Nucleic acid binder design. Sequence first.
DNA 1: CTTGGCTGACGTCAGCCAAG
DNA 2: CTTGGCTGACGTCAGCCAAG
Lengths: 53, 53, 39, 39
Amino acid sequence: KREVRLMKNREAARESRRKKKEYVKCLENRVAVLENQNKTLIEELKALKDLYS
Amino acid sequence: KREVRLMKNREAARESRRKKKEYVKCLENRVAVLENQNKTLIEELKALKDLYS
Amino acid sequence: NPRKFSEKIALQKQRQAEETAAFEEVMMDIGSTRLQAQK
Amino acid sequence: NPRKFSEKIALQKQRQAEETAAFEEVMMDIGSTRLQAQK
DNA sequence: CTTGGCTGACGTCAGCCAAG
DNA sequence: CTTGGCTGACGTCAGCCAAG
Ligand SMILES: [Zn+2]
């Protein structure tokens, strides 16, 4: 039963790596989104501040 | 010379893991910063929009 | 933070959907802003 | 993107410093905004 | 064109923390 | 308190891409 006890661990490592890389790609995606949102908000703030001049 | 050829690889794996985890912590930190910046910008936009009413 | 990556991805996607919702709602009202600002 | 993590961390920290610089500069001028807005 | 730095994948071992 | 899911660390092997 130890052979299957190592087989299930071997299989679990694969899915753990998959979820790891997927999670990192998710983080980077979220960073890019937040960067674009930040740039847009800052530009709109500059526009509304120039609106008073 | 193959023994040292594996030793330097063993040592390099450690620093590679260190840089990996450090890089992920950097990403998460950047996400938190971008979240706070987004919330602040959005609140200021709401305030300036209410300024016209 | 939760160990299992499913929960981390769930948190990041939920937070991202919420912040994108509030951001989209906020950006919807700049036209009426610049229209009412000139009158 | 560059493979070596030193370059990835360098990019993230440089971009973060730049966006934080522009953000800080933008937030410096809300007082005069609300002062000149009332007059 | 050919070493070497460096990094993805794999497999194994501890080890955690909740589900049983 | 005790399995099992799941995930950090390690070590090894290919393999890349630029530095030699
Ligand atoms: Zn790993």
